[PDB]
Symmetry: D2
Subunit: 267 residues, 4 copies
C-alpha cells in the first residue's frame, strides 16, 4: 500500500511489463494513466481497474499523442506524480552482418523512434505536470543498456541511449524532478519487433542468470513501486538499477558460483 | 508494514544511517539484531524497540564477534533474512600528501579492517544462515565508491573495494543469496575516523547535490527496505544503487541544471 | 613511424579531430581514406598529404556512400586495417525544455542519423574488409557518452548509444575484428548542428578540466594511434577510453584537487 | 621509439608483466628503475639492460623502501616521468566459504598491503618527483577490478580498490600529475599468493576471451607505453583501459559472436 494517492503515467502498458506495472500500481492504491497503440487492450485494462486506471489510444512516437496522454491524465486524476516511459521494441537480436542493406535504414528509424524518441517525448509532454507535482521519471531500460548480446546493434544502442537520457534528464530537471532508470532482464515476454526484420531455458539458467530462475513479470514491478513511493526515494536521482537476475555479475564457466553452498555449509 | 516476519542483522546500527535502518526495519514489522562497539547507544535502541531489537557489543574487525552477533540473532529470532554490513569509518577526506609518513600504515589498517574486512567477516559469519533462508546481503557503499572527492585515497579505495565485494559475492553466493549495494551520499552524519589522524556539505550544496536539498537520515532507509522485501527485489543481485542526491550526474557550473525551469513553463 | 603499411578509413575527417587524425595517421606512415560531406576541405587535405590521402565526398547517413568510401579505400590502397567512425553533429547543449515541439522530431532524426546510423553504416560497409585484414574499429565517442552536461538530451543519448555500439560490435565482430571507443572531451572545435535549431570552455575550465589546460586537437590523436597499432593493442576490445581531461574524476568545488601541492612539497 | 629520454619507475618488475614492461620500456629508449623483493632477478634485469635499468631491493609494503626506490631512481637518472605501481598478489581465486576462519585475517592483511597499500606508498614516495617532472601514474589493475570470477573476495576487492585510487589520485594530483589505470587480463602468468592460503585453455577461448587467443606478456606492454609517451596522452587522466581480451563484452553462450563471419561474408 505504498502508492496511496499517487498518480502514474505509464507508456506501452497494455501488455507485458507495462501491464504488470499497471496491475501492481493499481493494487498499491495508485491511479494510472496508460498511453498505448492497442485500443481494445486499453479498454480491457480500464474495466479491470475501474476508476483507478484510464487508457488513451495513441503513438509514443507522436508528441501530440503524448500531450493527449498527459492532458487526459490531468483531466481524470488532477496530477502526474510518476512517469514511466516503458514502451519498447526489440530487434530479434539481429547481428549487423544479418541486417539487410535495403532494410537497415527503416529498421533504425522504427526502433529508435519508439525506444528513444518515445522516451524523449513522454518526458517532454509530462514535464509541466512533473515540475508541478515535483515528481519523478522512471525509465524502463534493459540489460542491453549495459551489456552486449541482449540484442543486435540497434536494440543495444537504443537501450544504451536511454541510460544517457537518465543521466542528462536527471541533471536537466533537477532540483524539481528526479530521473531514474530500471534495467530489467531475464523476463518471459511477448516482445515484438519492426516489420523490416524477419536462448533455451537450460542454457539460460546455467550461463545467463546467476539467480537460477526466470521470474514472472510481477517480480519486476517492485523496483518501480520503490521509485514511485513518495518518501522512499527522495535522495535517488540519476540512479541505475540493474534488475536482470545478475547478468553483469555472472561467472566465466557458470552463471552462479555457489550452487554447492547448501551441502558445503552442512545445512 | 512490508517486512513483517523478516529478520535483519545490521552492523554499525547504533547511530547514524544504521540506527535509522534499525528504526525503519522495526517499524516495517521486522526484527533487528545489531552489531556495534558503542555500548550506550545499543542500550538506547533496545529500550526504544523492546524485544524487537537485540544489541550485541563487539568489533566488526573480529570474526568471532561477528559470529557472536549471528548466534544471538538466531537465538533471539530464529533466522537471518537480510544482512546489512553498514559499519564504516571516514578519513576526513585527508589527501595522500596530508597523510603523515608514520601514521599512514596504521591508518590504512584501521580504515580497511572496519570498511572492508568487517564487511567480509559479517557475510562469512552469516553465510550458513542466509543460505538457509535464501536471504540477501545489502552493502552500504558510498558516492566514494564511484566518484572521487567523497573522501581521501583511503576511504575512496575502501568504498570502491566494497563495490568489488558486491560483484564477487553476488556471483559466489548465487543462486541462493542475493548480494546488492546501496551507496548513500547527501547524508550529514558524525562519521568518525582513526585515532591515527587529526568543509560542511551545506556550504557547498549547489556544487554537490542536484536534488537541491539535504535529505534526512530517514530518507535513506527506503532503498534497504526494497532489497529486504523478497517479493519486490527477487531479480536483483549485483545491483549498485547510487543514492547520493545525484552526485554522479551533476553539471559543471552548478549541480542542478533546471533552476529556471518553472518559469520556462509558467508554473 | 608506428603505422607504416597500415590503411585507415576515417569519417568526418576533413576538419577538427578527424583532420588531426588524418594528419597524424599519414605522419605515422599510414594511408588514409576520408569520408566527409565537405568538398573544399577534402581537397585541402588531398594536396597536403599527396597520394597518401584520398577524399571521397558523401553523407555518412547514406550506406551506399559509406560503401563507396570503402570501395575507394580498397581501390587506392588495397585494404582497410583501421576504421574510425568519427563524423558527428552537436545539439548546442539545448535542453529538452528549449527544444521546440515542431523542431524536435526532425532534430532527433538529424542528430541520430549522423551520430549513430552513420557509425552503423560505416562498420557495415567496411565489415568484409576489416574481417579480411583482422583489423579493428575505433569509435569517437565523447564525455557526453558517460556523463551529463556535455550536450542536451539528443547529443547525450547519441553518444551514449555509440557506447552501446562499442560493446555490441566488440562481441559481434570477435574474434577477428576488435572494436574500441575513444571519448575525447577538452576539445575546442567548431562542432556544428542541425538546421532545425538555433558557454565557452575557457570561461569554465576550473570547473570542467582537472588537467588545468586546454589540449590541442593534435593531443587527441595518440589514443587512436594506439588502437591502430596491431602490436600494441591486441588484447583490447570493448575498451572505453575516457579522454576528456578528467571530467569524470573532477571535484565538487573545483575540477582539480591539488592546486596547492608544489608548496606542500616545496618544489 | 616513443620513450626516448623518459624515465619510469616500475614496482614488482623482476618477473611477469612487470619484467615485460621493463624490457619493452628499455627497448623504447626509456630509463627504468625497479623496486622488487627479488635481489638476484633484479641484478639479472640490470645486466640485461646495462645503464638503462637500475634495480633496488625492497618491499612495496614499506614506504621507506619506496622512498629508497624513488631516491635511487633520481640519483641514477635525474627524474621520474612515469610511475607504474605494478606489484600484486593473487588469492588462487579462493571463495569466501573456502577461506578458513583461522587464516582469513592474515590473508586480508597480506593481499591488501601489497595490492593497495603498495600502490598508495609508491605514489606517496614518488609524488615530489612526479610534480617536478609533471608526469603520470599508471596503475596496473585487473579485470578483477571490474568483473567477478577473476579472483576471490580478497583479490577482487583489492583490484576494485585501485580503481578507486585511479579516480581519487587523478583528482588529487591534478593539474600537475595525471593518474590512469590499465586493467590487463587473460595473461599467461606465474602469479603467486599468500602463505595463509593453500581454467582450461579450451574453456578460456570459448567462454572467457572473445579475442579467441591468450596473448603473451609482450602484447600487454603497449598500453603502458601509450600512457608513458610524452605527447600522446596529455588529455588522459582518470582513464580506465580494460585490456583483457574483451571479458566485459563477452556473450552469454559463447565469448565471441562472429566466428562465422569470414565464410558468411564470402571471403
Ligand atoms: N524481452 C525481455 O525480456 C526484455 C528485456 C529487457 C528489457 N525489456 C523491456 O521491457 C519493456 C516492456 O516490454 P513488454 O514485455 O511489455 O513488451 P510487449 O511487446 O509485451 O509490450 C509493449 C507495449 O508497447 C506498446 N507499443 C509499442 N510501440 C508503441 C508505439 N509506437 N506507440 C504506442 N504504443 C506502443 C505495444 O502496444 C505493447 O502494448 C520494453 O521497453 C522492453 O524493451 C524486455
Ligand atoms: N557521512 C556521510 O555523509 C556518508 C556518506 C556516504 C556513505 N556513508 C556511510 O554510511 C555508513 C554508516 O555510517 P554513518 O554514516 O551512520 O556514520 P556513524 O559514525 O554515525 O555510524 C557508524 C557506526 O559504526 C559503528 N562502528 C564503527 N566502527 C566500528 C567497529 N570497529 N566495530 C563495531 N562498530 C563500529 C559506530 O559505533 C557507529 O555506530 C558508513 O559505512 C559510511 O561510510 C556516510
Ligand atoms: N567539440 C568538442 O569539444 C567535442 C567533444 C567531445 C567529442 N567530440 C566529437 O568529436 C567528433 C569529431 O567532430 P569534431 O569535434 O572535429 O567537429 P567538426 O565539426 O570539426 O568535425 C565534424 C566533421 O564531420 C563532417 N560531417 C558532419 N556531418 C556529416 C555527414 N552527414 N556526412 C559526412 N560528413 C559529415 C563535417 O563535415 C566535419 O568535417 C564528433 O563526433 C564530436 O561529437 C567533440
Ligand atoms: N594472473 C593474471 O593473468 C593477471 C590478471 C590480471 C591482473 N594481473 C596483475 O598483473 C600484475 C603483475 O603480475 P605478474 O605476472 O608480474 O606476477 P608475478 O608474480 O610474476 O610478478 C610479481 C612481482 O612482484 C614482486 N613482489 C610481490 N610482492 C612484493 C612485495 N611485497 N615487495 C616487493 N616486491 C614484491 C615479486 O617479487 C614479483 O617479481 C599484478 O599486479 C597482477 O595483479 C595478473
Amino acid at each position: 500500500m505504498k502508492l496511496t494517492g499517487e498518480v502514474a503515467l505509464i507508456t506501452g502498458g497494455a501488455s507485458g511489463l507495462g501491464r504488470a506495472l499497471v496491475d501492481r500500481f493499481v493494487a498499491e492504491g495508485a491511479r494510472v494513466a496508460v498511453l498505448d497503440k492497442s485500443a481494445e487492450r486499453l479498454r480491457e485494462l480500464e474495466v479491470a481497474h475501474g476508476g483507478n486506471a484510464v487508457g488513451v489510444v495513441g503513438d509514443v512516437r507522436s508528441l501530440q499523442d503524448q500531450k493527449r496522454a498527459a492532458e487526459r491524465c490531468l483531466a481524470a486524476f488532477g496530477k502526474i506524480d510518476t512517469l514511466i516511459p516503458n514502451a519498447g521494441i526489440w530487434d530479434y537480436s539481429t547481428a549487423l552482418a544479418d541486417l539487410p542493406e535495403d532494410k537497415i535504414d527503416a529498421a533504425f528509424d522504427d526502433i529508435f523512434h519508439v525506444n528513444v524518441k518515445g522516451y524523449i517525448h513522454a518526458v517532454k509532454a509530462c514535464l509541466p505536470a512533473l515540475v508541478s507535482s515535483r515528481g519523478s521519471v522512471v525509465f524502463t531500460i534493459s540489460n542491453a543498456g549495459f551489456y552486449p548480446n541482449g540484442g543486435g546493434p540497434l536494440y543495444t544502442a537504443t537501450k544504451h541511449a536511454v541510460v544517457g537520457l537518465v543521466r542528462q534528464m536527471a541533471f536537466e530537471l533537477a532540483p524539481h524532478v528526479r530521473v531514474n532508470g530500471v534495467a530489467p532482464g531475464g523476463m518471459n515476454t511477448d516482445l515484438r519487433g519492426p516489420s523490416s526484420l524477419g536462448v533455451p531455458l537450460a542454457d539460460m539458467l546455467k550461463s545467463v542468470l546467476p539467480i537460477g530462475r526466470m521470474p514472472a513479470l510481477e517480480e519486476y514491478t517492485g523496483a518501480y513501486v520503490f521509485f514511485a513511493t513518495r518518501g522512499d526515494s527522495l535522495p535517488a536521482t540519476g540512479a541505475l538499477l540493474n534488475y536482470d537476475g545478475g547478468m553483469g555479475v555472472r561467472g566465466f564457466l557458470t552463471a552462479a558460483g555457489g550452487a554447492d553452498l547448501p551441502e558445503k555449509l552442512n545445512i
